[PDB]
Subunit: 270 residues, 2 copies
């Protein structure tokens, strides 16, 4: 029959590649994917879960960005494999395939501190409770706190998922709040690209005055000028591991795909 997949975005390279590889693997066990689009609404996620569960999916896969209490209960009670992907939640319902978003941002922030950056500012989302962006902010804050530096050194705007346009809006805001910033670490590559576009427009040198770092290795990071330093992930592997896990189970596991820090010319001295 089918496996359900819930996603918060239909405009995301990672989820597209995850779905493609997951599709390919499941086709080998005779299964199709049925998708639900939540648009970041935990309430809509709940409604979609209830609807799908009624149709008796063989497994459920959810891209993690927080759940309602009732969603957790419905999934726990379903007696089928549950897989949460793209994050290691504090309290996994069943299996997970992904990595710690908190740890990834902590590691990147530490790499930037090690490279001698003196005034790093995090750019993230408003109204992002329980999402992957909130975990990234948390990892940044932990790194700054451990370094004796200022964890409040951050700007929040928009909503999940921060856009290129939001990055454009953030440029002046960051420079207003932290004029001496030498590095901006963004919640993903999308606002990083917008930030880069606006800094170039206003004549701020990147990276000579301000360095720019994103997250995700989305396409824009590789084709921007300069190319944007980022945290590289493996969406094909996430889809394949998730598919393989499901087929094994139907013939709790926590499977880690370690991110890679990708330093490119948008970071000074790289």
């Amino acid at each position: 029959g089918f496996v359900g997949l819930l996603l918060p975005s239909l405009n995301n390279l990672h989820f597209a590649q995850t779905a493609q590889s997951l599709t390919d693997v499941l086709e080998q066990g005779g299964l199709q994917l049925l998708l639900g689009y939540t648009a970041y609404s935990p309430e809509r996620e709940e409604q979609l879960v209830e609807t799908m569960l009624r149709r008796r999916p063989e497994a459920m896969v959810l891209s993690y960005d927080g759940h309602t209490e009732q969603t957790i209960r419905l999934l726990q009670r379903a007696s089928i494999p549950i897989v949460e992907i793209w994050e290691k939640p504090a309290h996994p319902i069943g299996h997970t395939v992904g990595f710690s978003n908190e740890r990834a941002a902590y590691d990147m922030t530490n790499a930037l501190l090690a490279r001698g950056f003196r005034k790093i500012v995090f750019l993230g989302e408003k109204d992002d409770d329980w999402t992957r962006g909130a975990a990234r902010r948390a990892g940044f804050k932990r790194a700054m706190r451990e370094a004796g530096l200022n964890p409040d050194q951050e700007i929040r705007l928009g909503a999940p998922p921060l856009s290129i346009e939001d990055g454009v809006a953030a440029a002046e805001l960051i420079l207003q709040e932290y004029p001496d910033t030498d590095c901006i670490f963004c919640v993903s590559d999308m606002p990083a690209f917008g930030l880069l576009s606006r800094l170039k427009s206003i004549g701020v040198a990147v990276p000579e005055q301000v360095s720019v770092v994103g997250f995700g290795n989305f396409e824009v990071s590789r084709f921007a000028s300069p190319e944007i330093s980022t945290v590289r992930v493996d969406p094909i592997a996430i889809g394949r591991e998730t598919g393989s896990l499901i087929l094994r189970l139907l013939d709790a596991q926590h499977i880690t795909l370690p991110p890679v820090l990708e330093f490119r010319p948008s970071l000074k001295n790289e």
Copy 2:
């Protein structure tokens, strides 16, 4: 009940916005949206149509890029509203919501000719029979043919959908085959952005040496430097009109949302 939506991409702003507005309208009417991901494959589309129809959706919405004969038969024999979106097919099964891709590309090409560009090259896909990209090529060719110009001024690579990375690879193919080109009209903004990135890398001035024009008003077109001239579409309206049509039918129509040409600094004199 639910409505089924089949889409070829999970990395596409248009389809994301369509799904979001379609979701909003349907939810207000008590219906949910469930998705099938085709990955531009007519064979996967057929397999998804066959299983989804058996789950008894209230209506089926198909993002149009051509169908197998079997898919057509399955949809013809259904006694539920069928809506093909994002293109006006030559032979619609039921209802449509979208616009003529052929006419849109013909219109843009004519606008370029009116602006004095002569050596326009279309950048498009291989293995794209029956898809929206093929329609765009046809519109470009008709414009060139009617103007008494050479319609065989084009480069084909990759597969639907042409990517940013494909645009990068196209730069050298185009300049090798057509060294005198003054304007490249790409099948969408995505290869246009890649093309722009590569031309900037190698030192070809846009628009002074070569102008670049895309299709779809994707986010990169608005924040690239220079901003990318494009064909602006209305995905919110497409999703809204599709949802509203379905609810009216449940209580043939051809709903037309004419695109708008957007001229930006990637076009000489704009």
